[PDB]
Design a protein around this motif. Structure first.
Motif, PDB file in Angstrom:
ATOM      1  N   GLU A  70       0.795  -1.210   0.000  1.00  0.00           N
ATOM      2  CA  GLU A  70       0.000   0.000   0.000  1.00  0.00           C
ATOM      3  C   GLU A  70       0.833   1.268   0.000  1.00  0.00           C
ATOM      4  O   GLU A  70       0.281   2.345  -0.229  1.00  0.00           O
ATOM      5  CB  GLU A  70      -0.948   0.012   1.203  1.00  0.00           C
ATOM      6  CG  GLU A  70      -2.039  -1.033   1.100  1.00  0.00           C
ATOM      7  CD  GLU A  70      -2.813  -1.201   2.386  1.00  0.00           C
ATOM      8  OE1 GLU A  70      -2.178  -1.280   3.458  1.00  0.00           O
ATOM      9  OE2 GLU A  70      -4.057  -1.258   2.324  1.00  0.00           O
ATOM     10  N   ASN A  71       2.135   1.181   0.248  1.00  0.00           N
ATOM     11  CA  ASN A  71       2.966   2.374   0.218  1.00  0.00           C
ATOM     12  C   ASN A  71       4.044   2.318  -0.857  1.00  0.00           C
ATOM     13  O   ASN A  71       4.935   3.174  -0.859  1.00  0.00           O
ATOM     14  CB  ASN A  71       3.600   2.600   1.585  1.00  0.00           C
ATOM     15  CG  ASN A  71       2.571   2.744   2.666  1.00  0.00           C
ATOM     16  OD1 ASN A  71       2.510   1.943   3.588  1.00  0.00           O
ATOM     17  ND2 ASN A  71       1.727   3.754   2.543  1.00  0.00           N
ATOM     18  N   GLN A  72       3.969   1.339  -1.760  1.00  0.00           N
ATOM     19  CA  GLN A  72       4.954   1.156  -2.822  1.00  0.00           C
ATOM     20  C   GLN A  72       5.426   2.469  -3.437  1.00  0.00           C
ATOM     21  O   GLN A  72       6.631   2.710  -3.567  1.00  0.00           O
ATOM     22  CB  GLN A  72       4.359   0.256  -3.897  1.00  0.00           C
ATOM     23  CG  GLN A  72       5.318  -0.100  -4.985  1.00  0.00           C
ATOM     24  CD  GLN A  72       5.022  -1.451  -5.569  1.00  0.00           C
ATOM     25  OE1 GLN A  72       3.946  -2.003  -5.359  1.00  0.00           O
ATOM     26  NE2 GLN A  72       5.976  -1.999  -6.308  1.00  0.00           N
ATOM     27  N   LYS A  73       4.490   3.309  -3.868  1.00  0.00           N
ATOM     28  CA  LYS A  73       4.862   4.535  -4.559  1.00  0.00           C
ATOM     29  C   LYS A  73       5.732   5.426  -3.685  1.00  0.00           C
ATOM     30  O   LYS A  73       6.798   5.903  -4.103  1.00  0.00           O
ATOM     31  CB  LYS A  73       3.602   5.275  -4.996  1.00  0.00           C
ATOM     32  CG  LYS A  73       3.849   6.301  -6.070  1.00  0.00           C
ATOM     33  CD  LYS A  73       2.585   6.574  -6.848  1.00  0.00           C
ATOM     34  CE  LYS A  73       2.067   5.300  -7.481  1.00  0.00           C
ATOM     35  NZ  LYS A  73       3.128   4.628  -8.277  1.00  0.00           N
ATOM     36  N   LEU A  74       5.266   5.668  -2.462  1.00  0.00           N
ATOM     37  CA  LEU A  74       6.042   6.456  -1.517  1.00  0.00           C
ATOM     38  C   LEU A  74       7.417   5.842  -1.303  1.00  0.00           C
ATOM     39  O   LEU A  74       8.425   6.551  -1.209  1.00  0.00           O
ATOM     40  CB  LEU A  74       5.286   6.562  -0.201  1.00  0.00           C
ATOM     41  CG  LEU A  74       6.083   7.258   0.890  1.00  0.00           C
ATOM     42  CD1 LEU A  74       6.317   8.689   0.484  1.00  0.00           C
ATOM     43  CD2 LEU A  74       5.358   7.189   2.210  1.00  0.00           C
ATOM     44  N   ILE A  75       7.468   4.514  -1.217  1.00  0.00           N
ATOM     45  CA  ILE A  75       8.743   3.827  -1.048  1.00  0.00           C
ATOM     46  C   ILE A  75       9.685   4.190  -2.178  1.00  0.00           C
ATOM     47  O   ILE A  75      10.850   4.542  -1.961  1.00  0.00           O
ATOM     48  CB  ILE A  75       8.529   2.310  -0.987  1.00  0.00           C
ATOM     49  CG1 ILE A  75       7.659   1.959   0.195  1.00  0.00           C
ATOM     50  CG2 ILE A  75       9.853   1.621  -0.849  1.00  0.00           C
ATOM     51  CD1 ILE A  75       8.298   2.344   1.472  1.00  0.00           C
ATOM     52  N   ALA A  76       9.191   4.081  -3.406  1.00  0.00           N
ATOM     53  CA  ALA A  76      10.011   4.382  -4.567  1.00  0.00           C
ATOM     54  C   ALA A  76      10.551   5.797  -4.481  1.00  0.00           C
ATOM     55  O   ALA A  76      11.743   6.044  -4.700  1.00  0.00           O
ATOM     56  CB  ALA A  76       9.199   4.188  -5.846  1.00  0.00           C
ATOM     57  N   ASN A  77       9.673   6.745  -4.163  1.00  0.00           N
ATOM     58  CA  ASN A  77      10.098   8.139  -4.120  1.00  0.00           C
ATOM     59  C   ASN A  77      11.187   8.344  -3.077  1.00  0.00           C
ATOM     60  O   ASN A  77      12.199   9.011  -3.334  1.00  0.00           O
ATOM     61  CB  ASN A  77       8.899   9.037  -3.844  1.00  0.00           C
ATOM     62  CG  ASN A  77       7.806   8.857  -4.864  1.00  0.00           C
ATOM     63  OD1 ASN A  77       7.886   7.979  -5.719  1.00  0.00           O
ATOM     64  ND2 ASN A  77       6.774   9.685  -4.783  1.00  0.00           N
ATOM     65  N   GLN A  78      11.004   7.755  -1.895  1.00  0.00           N
ATOM     66  CA  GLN A  78      11.994   7.918  -0.839  1.00  0.00           C
ATOM     67  C   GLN A  78      13.326   7.318  -1.250  1.00  0.00           C
ATOM     68  O   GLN A  78      14.387   7.920  -1.045  1.00  0.00           O
ATOM     69  CB  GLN A  78      11.496   7.285   0.456  1.00  0.00           C
ATOM     70  CG  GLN A  78      10.187   7.849   0.936  1.00  0.00           C
ATOM     71  CD  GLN A  78       9.944   7.570   2.392  1.00  0.00           C
ATOM     72  OE1 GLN A  78      10.816   7.784   3.227  1.00  0.00           O
ATOM     73  NE2 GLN A  78       8.755   7.082   2.708  1.00  0.00           N
ATOM     74  N   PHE A  79      13.290   6.133  -1.849  1.00  0.00           N
ATOM     75  CA  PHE A  79      14.532   5.483  -2.235  1.00  0.00           C
ATOM     76  C   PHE A  79      15.267   6.301  -3.286  1.00  0.00           C
ATOM     77  O   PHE A  79      16.489   6.476  -3.214  1.00  0.00           O
ATOM     78  CB  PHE A  79      14.242   4.077  -2.739  1.00  0.00           C
ATOM     79  CG  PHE A  79      15.463   3.313  -3.122  1.00  0.00           C
ATOM     80  CD1 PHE A  79      16.670   3.556  -2.512  1.00  0.00           C
ATOM     81  CD2 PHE A  79      15.405   2.347  -4.093  1.00  0.00           C
ATOM     82  CE1 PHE A  79      17.787   2.856  -2.875  1.00  0.00           C
ATOM     83  CE2 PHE A  79      16.514   1.642  -4.452  1.00  0.00           C
ATOM     84  CZ  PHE A  79      17.709   1.897  -3.844  1.00  0.00           C
ATOM     85  N   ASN A  80      14.538   6.807  -4.278  1.00  0.00           N
ATOM     86  CA  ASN A  80      15.175   7.605  -5.317  1.00  0.00           C
ATOM     87  C   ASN A  80      15.817   8.852  -4.732  1.00  0.00           C
ATOM     88  O   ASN A  80      16.962   9.192  -5.054  1.00  0.00           O
ATOM     89  CB  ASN A  80      14.158   7.979  -6.386  1.00  0.00           C
ATOM     90  CG  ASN A  80      13.473   6.782  -6.960  1.00  0.00           C
ATOM     91  OD1 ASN A  80      14.120   5.832  -7.389  1.00  0.00           O
ATOM     92  ND2 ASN A  80      12.150   6.811  -6.971  1.00  0.00           N
ATOM     93  N   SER A  81      15.078   9.564  -3.882  1.00  0.00           N
ATOM     94  CA  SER A  81      15.649  10.746  -3.249  1.00  0.00           C
ATOM     95  C   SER A  81      16.907  10.394  -2.468  1.00  0.00           C
ATOM     96  O   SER A  81      17.893  11.139  -2.491  1.00  0.00           O
ATOM     97  CB  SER A  81      14.615  11.401  -2.342  1.00  0.00           C
ATOM     98  OG  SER A  81      13.938  10.421  -1.580  1.00  0.00           O
ATOM     99  N   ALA A  82      16.896   9.254  -1.775  1.00  0.00           N
ATOM    100  CA  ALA A  82      18.076   8.850  -1.022  1.00  0.00           C
ATOM    101  C   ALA A  82      19.259   8.617  -1.948  1.00  0.00           C
ATOM    102  O   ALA A  82      20.387   9.027  -1.654  1.00  0.00           O
ATOM    103  CB  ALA A  82      17.774   7.595  -0.213  1.00  0.00           C
ATOM    104  N   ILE A  83      19.018   7.937  -3.068  1.00  0.00           N
ATOM    105  CA  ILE A  83      20.088   7.717  -4.037  1.00  0.00           C
ATOM    106  C   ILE A  83      20.653   9.045  -4.510  1.00  0.00           C
ATOM    107  O   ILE A  83      21.872   9.208  -4.652  1.00  0.00           O
ATOM    108  CB  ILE A  83      19.585   6.868  -5.215  1.00  0.00           C
ATOM    109  CG1 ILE A  83      19.261   5.454  -4.752  1.00  0.00           C
ATOM    110  CG2 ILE A  83      20.624   6.817  -6.302  1.00  0.00           C
ATOM    111  CD1 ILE A  83      20.466   4.710  -4.270  1.00  0.00           C
TER     112      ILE A  83
END
Lengths: 100, 98
Positions: A70-83
């Motif tokens: 249910e939070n996949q999208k948010l997960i992706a965004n956070q990971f990309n920003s971290a990278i």
């Protein structure tokens, strides 16, 4: 400096592995991880969709899957920003490579 | 799995007994199913399909079962999850009722 060193017998036996080869190794490892979960360390790699492998790693730390699915999208965004932040922190003169 | 030591001069030797899967088959997974608009996730398995029906099974040995409400659990409506697949989640209560 370098030739001065060479000028008294002191040689530098070059490494056995060439950095291109090592880079290829790391590429292999990275693809193995991002495609086969953790299996390939125990035999032949097994393809498996990424999201499902992520949800498995979440159950790893006692977090039921629905949070991920249910939070996949948010997960992706956070990971990309971290990278991106990693890209900065390394590109910036901030030097973590003292240990080398 | 386990390991047995065996002595040796100025040393020791182990005999690890590891466990390695052998031969596989590719199937078509999916994250979840919603029978009545409400999602259903596997409690410990993974949803797979021989192509026609659906089953859940442990992650290291193909052994399918019929999807009952006892190895599955619900987490709300089935609109927000990705890759879900319309199907039925058979229930044992009604058939055992009579």
């Amino acid at each position: 400096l370098i030739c001065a060193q060479k000028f008294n017998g002191l040689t530098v036996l070059p490494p056995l592995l060439t950095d291109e080869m090592i880079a290829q190794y790391t590429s292999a490892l990275l693809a193995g991880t991002i495609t086969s979960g953790w299996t390939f360390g125990a035999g032949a790699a097994l393809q498996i969709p990424f999201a499902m492998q992520m949800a498995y790693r979440f159950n790893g730390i006692g977090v039921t899957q629905n949070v991920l699915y249910e939070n996949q999208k948010l997960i992706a965004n956070q990971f990309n920003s971290a990278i991106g932040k990693i890209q900065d922190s390394l590109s910036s003169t901030a030097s973590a490579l003292g240990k080398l | 799995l386990m390991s047995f030591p065996q002595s040796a001069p100025h040393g020791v030797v182990f005999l690890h007994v590891t466990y390695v899967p052998a031969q596989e088959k590719n199937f078509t997974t999916a994250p979840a199913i919603c029978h009545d608009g409400k999602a259903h996730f596997p409690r410990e398995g993974v949803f797979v399909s021989n192509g026609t029906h659906w089953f859940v099974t442990q992650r290291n040995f193909y052994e399918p079962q019929i999807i009952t409400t006892d190895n599955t659990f619900v987490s709300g409506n089935c609109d927000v999850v990705i890759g879900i697949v319309n199907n039925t989640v058979y229930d044992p209560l009604q058939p055992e009722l009579d």
